[PDB]
Amino acid sequence: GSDEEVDSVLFGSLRGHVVGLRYYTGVVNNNEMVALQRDPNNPYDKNAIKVNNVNGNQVGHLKKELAGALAYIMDNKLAQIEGVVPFGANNAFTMPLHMTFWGKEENRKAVSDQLKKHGFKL
């Protein structure tokens, strides 16, 4: 259970750039935290990660390139990608995202392999 899966070590922090903001509003709280979820519906793009902040707005979304790496780590729950917005979404346009990446030694090989192979983080 949670003693296995929630128990994860820090990989570090990853830098991203959310294109999905300008979809509807591109507004959040000045220091939000965004949760990365996989496809909420998207049939042919199951890779497409639907990002939603802890306020409850589905404001963020990855591109098929960015999501194309993290999709394996997301769907199979190989590691945790926890997003945070210190920028506050001052503009509706694309801003730097700060994702603090967690995961376990066992999965680190497969995860890091995909991260350097595809070369995409968000």
Helix and strand arrangement:
Blueprint: H1 2-5, E1 9-18, E2 32-37, E3 50-53, E4 60-61, H2 64-75, E5 79-85, E6 95-103, H3 105-118
Antiparallel strand pairs: 1-6, 2-3, 2-5, 3-4, 5-6
Protein name: Helicase-like transcription factor
Subcellular location: Cytoplasm; Nucleus; Nucleus, Nucleolus; Nucleus, Nucleoplasm
Family: Belongs to the SNF2/RAD54 helicase family. RAD16 subfamily.
Describe this structure in words.
Belongs to the SNF2/RAD54 helicase family. RAD16 subfamily. With about 120 residues, the chain is of the alpha+beta class. Helices cover about 25% and strands about 30% of the residues. The chain has three helices and six strands; from the N terminus they run H-E-E-E-E-H-E-E-H. The chain has a six-stranded antiparallel beta sheet. Strand 3 and strand 4 (about 60) form a beta hairpin. Helix 2 (about 65-75) packs antiparallel against helix 3 (about 105-120). The chain is globular.
In short, what is this structure?
The chain is of the alpha+beta class and 122 residues long.
* H/E series: HEEEEHEEH
Instruction: Give me the count of strands.
Output: 6
| Count of discrete structural domains | 1
Shape: globular
Strand content: 25-35%
The value of Rg in angstroms is 14 Å
> What is the count of DSSP helices, taking H or I runs of 4+ residues?
3
| Secondary-structure content class | alpha+beta
Helicity, as a percent range: 10-25%
N→C terminal distance: 27 Å
Strand order of the largest sheet: 1-6-5-2-3-4
Largest sheet: 6 strands, antiparallel
Protein name: Helicase-like transcription factor
Subcellular location: Cytoplasm; Nucleus; Nucleus, Nucleolus; Nucleus, Nucleoplasm
Organism: Homo sapiens (Human)
Family: Belongs to the SNF2/RAD54 helicase family. RAD16 subfamily.
